[PDB]
Amino acid sequence: NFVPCSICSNNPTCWAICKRI
Amino acid sequence: QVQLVQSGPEVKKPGASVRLSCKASGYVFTNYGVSWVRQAPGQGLEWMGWSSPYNGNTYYAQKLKARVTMTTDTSTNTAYMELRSLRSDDTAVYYCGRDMLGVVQAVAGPFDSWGQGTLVTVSSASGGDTPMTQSPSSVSASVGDRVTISCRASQGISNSLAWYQQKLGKAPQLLIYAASSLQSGVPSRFSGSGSGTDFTLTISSLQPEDFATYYCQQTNTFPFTFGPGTKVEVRR
Numbered sequence: 391n392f393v394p395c396s397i398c399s400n401n402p403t404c405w406a407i408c409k410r411i
Numbered sequence: 412q413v414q415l416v417q418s419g420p421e422v423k424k425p426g427a428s429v430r431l432s433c434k435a436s437g438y439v440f441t442n443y444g445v446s447w448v449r450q451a452p453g454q455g456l457e458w459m460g461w462s463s464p465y466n467g468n469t470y471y472a473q474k475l476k477a478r479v480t481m482t483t484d485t486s487t488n489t490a491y492m493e494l495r496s497l498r499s500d501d502t503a504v505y506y507c508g509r510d511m512l513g514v515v516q517a518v519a520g521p522f523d524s525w526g527q528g529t530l531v532t533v534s535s536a537s538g539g540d541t542p543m544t545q546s547p548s549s550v551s552a553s554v555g556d557r558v559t560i561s562c563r564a565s566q567g568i569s570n571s572l573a574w575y576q577q578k579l580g581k582a583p584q585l586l587i588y589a590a591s592s593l594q595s596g597v598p599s600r601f602s603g604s605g606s607g608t609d610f611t612l613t614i615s616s617l618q619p620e621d622f623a624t625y626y627c628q629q630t631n632t633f634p635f636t637f638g639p640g641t642k643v644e645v646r647r
Contacts, residue, residue: 401632402461402519402630402632402633403514405468405470405519405633406468406513406515406517406518406519408468410468
């Protein structure tokens with residue numbers, strides 16, 4: 391599984407590691 | 412040695428677009444974020460957004476999201492920022508910066524290296540979820556004095572607080588990150604304290620090179636936001 395960028399909100403760590411779709 | 416070189420100055424009429432470039436050298440480009448901050452003449456610093464050379468992800472400040480695009484080219488180590496639908500209030504020096512090394516690859520954060528800035532002038536046609544404050548806005552001091560500047564975050568930011576020095580006509584320089592960690596190469600007379608909402612920068616014994624404007628910056632959540640600046644002036 392992976393972290394989708396659609397849920398990253400305002401979190402910079404999430405935005406650095408998420409996958410875009 | 413880390414270098415960011417930005418493209419030359421631009422003069423544009425309102426409604427036009429501009430594309431700026433920032434060439435990186437002296438480091439592994441894909442291990443660090445590249446971000447953009449602008450400064451209107453005589454005003455403070457405004458964070459525009461972040462880009463990852465590692466995976467192409469971006470985040471733009473909501474104020475600008477509709478009109479801005481940031482990209483990176485890892486074959487040429489070059490970052491790009493396009494700003495569209497220009498208006499008069501877009502006149503500013505635009506800086507690229509290297510987000511410092513973080514817990515995950517190329518994460519946004521304080522800038523440990525700055526480009527030299529690109530002036531974009533928009534020709535005349537007439538004539539921020541966590542706001543930050545600083546006190547005092549101006550203070551005068553003598554060489555040898557202790558100078559203490561306050562920063563306040565409108566919401567708790569834990570220790571995600573950086574301090575910068577900006578001398579007249581130059582890009583800012585990072586002094587303190589994580590509230591109290593002294594950046595490499597910065598003299599020990601600079602020290603930072605605080606956590607939560609109230610922070611301080613103190614200079615134990617002011618030196619002639621220390622007259623400058625000082626900015627705080629929260630990096631707890633996007634959009635990153637700067638305090639309005641404190642000018643430390645020579646006593647009249």
